[PDB]
């Protein structure tokens, strides 16, 4: 719809704002609405960003916004409120009468919190008195990377002294002094570094804490992020990423696993973006292509339901309503319509052990509810967990429960113990798979 | 790029992002011998002359024929136009990769990669077609939403479903409500009503083209596609998945209505998957086809596919070239008579099927099942002797399996070593 900030209408509308993010989607835009006399909520996926906007508004313009994050909450009364999706979700969502305008910044984000948070805004904002929701991103669905004036991009050839994802890095260009290199996994961040900390070029691997630079060559996963020492002269990109996916493996039910894929445009623009910051920069790549942005995996829907039940006190049917509003809204990332299936499985998961759930939550496991629940049925059948990986630590108490086969609900990682596939909850999920997933 | 690249002085690869004959004639006026490649040379509408019809400086052929001809012959062309270069069928990908690898050595000075739908393309509005979201209100349940009887009672309508089974079930529900509903899917008669009267065609993505009326299209916005699973049981599985449709698919389904007269498009999902990626099973297909059809050693197939993957502006895929090249290299001594048979039957992976049958016949062991795929072995009696030496899964497996054939172990090792 808009490449500029949409005016406030007289009846509720959902507007799309597609703008370069240097143009202050998170600063200039909410400030313009504020100057007009509106109360504006600004949502972002990351805690750092949210605090980072608050600071900039206090320092560069003397405006002290409300800040709302899990770790810290500041209330000044300013018409501008900065919050994370997660904190917005924990706050219970849209507070009646609070906001005239809600900006969903980085609306391209496909982590579970962002999707459930935006779904919630689209379900609730009109009823709560907002006149206008703005879905703001620099990279709408279908976006590909465009050229950058102060970054020249050069294909790697197979000629060179370092083996790199089927191609070669000529020894020179990483002796310029100032370099970031992206590898898909941890295991090959060491192996790649060590294949030249032993060669002496001086290199360190990131995935822990920070350890770098004013020379140096950093090789890291995506666990480093967009800021820090923006001075690099070149980036070298393997152009692939590790993503979470669900397999309906029927063994007995589903598996959450990881796949290595070609990077999408969001990934490529961002990795390339850590050079050419003022200076001229060079981008070197294994592969010229990229998936367009705008698709996400059904395993992320699973996560939304997991967080609904674990963090936000949402019955699955309520999470479905929020996600349904997301899925019905045009110009947002798309996924398989598996709402019925996941509402289905989580609704069958009754009488979870509160102590286990309040152990997996603190642990930072990805699916605290699913984990605590498998552990729940394990304890009550006096069976062992599916393995003695760290995920299952809430059960340390091998001793009574080592009685036999694990009653396996689903696969969240590697399964080491022998299993039994006949538990009523397992049969229940299988029936939900028949009921709610299509065939052929 | 929107306009036809002027012929340069050295060899290069250009991209023509043209919207929905055009350009080739222009290059032919200038003395240039041009070759134009498509998936098919049949009339794009389903009616009219073939593209190869003579009236020459311009040849019209297909990627399939081009590959069978052995690719680029001599200095026979200055300009090669790869049209519909967004196509991700195996023949198109191997065909384009062949052009890119051979064109310059064959003395061509320009390769045009033309498509109306570059990577990242999204479906755009149609001046002539009104689009309306289905609600959950209506008599006919449809992929989680509902079709109201009112919008298909009377008139002519096309409903897309993702499978044969869904088409039968939906048509039966319509007929029971008094609608003249007809199921269409491959294997059928174009018995879609002859005429002009009310009809609701319930169809898969068979039926292309055609000649229907259709005041409206209703779209499930779902597709079925082929995927490889690296399932370690023992090795990999070729399977079929349902995914959200991509922009190509939505545009094409919506384009059955609003031809001339205004039309109405009704949908289950507002969004599509952006176009521009394909599965690793397609790579596997390319090597299979290289070995069965085109007499290509796996390393020759790799060379062509690598050229494709180094070329910007084309659909992307996982880099499994070394993996697939490695498994086909191990597949030695295939039974020739079996390969002939799976080639004639139109199996999707004739080399892989025949090779599994070759391993069965030698161990005098039965096929993984007695589905039609395995009928080269049908001289059955001596062979049912025990477990199946299972190399990979190309379908459902009914027989008892054994996982210790050396070729199974070989492929497992390729998986360990070539797949991260
Ligand atoms: O920590 C944040 O502010 C974001 C967030 C992500 N997930 C959350 C769950 C609860 C609460 Br409170 C907050 C979050
Ligand atoms: Ca699978
Ligand atoms: Ca699998």
- SS summary, helix count of chain A: 13
Based on the structure, what is the oligomeric state of the protein chains? homodimer
Small ligands present: (5-bromo-1H-indol-3-yl)acetic acid, calcium ion
User: Percent of residues of chain A in helical segments?
Assistant: 25-40%
Backbone structural class of chain A = alpha/beta
What percent strand of chain A? Answer: 15-25%
Sheet having the most strands of chain A: 7 strands, mixed
CATH homology superfamily of the largest domain in chain A? RNA Helicase Chain A , domain 3
Briefly note the CATH topology name of the largest domain in chain A. RNA Helicase, Chain A, domain 3
Q: Which two chains have the most extensive interface, and how many residues on each?
A: A-B, 42 and 45 residues
CATH architecture of the largest domain in chain A: Orthogonal Bundle
Overall tally of structural domains of chain A: 3
Gap from first CA to last CA of chain A: 37 Å
Number of strands of chain A: 19
- Strand arrangement across the biggest beta sheet of chain A: 1-7-6-2-5-3-4
Family (chain B): Belongs to the hepacivirus polyprotein family.
Domain Helicase ATP-binding (chain B): 5-136
Subcellular location (chain B): Host cell membrane; Host cytoplasm, Host perinuclear region; Host endoplasmic reticulum membrane; Host lipid droplet
Protein name (chain B): Genome polyprotein
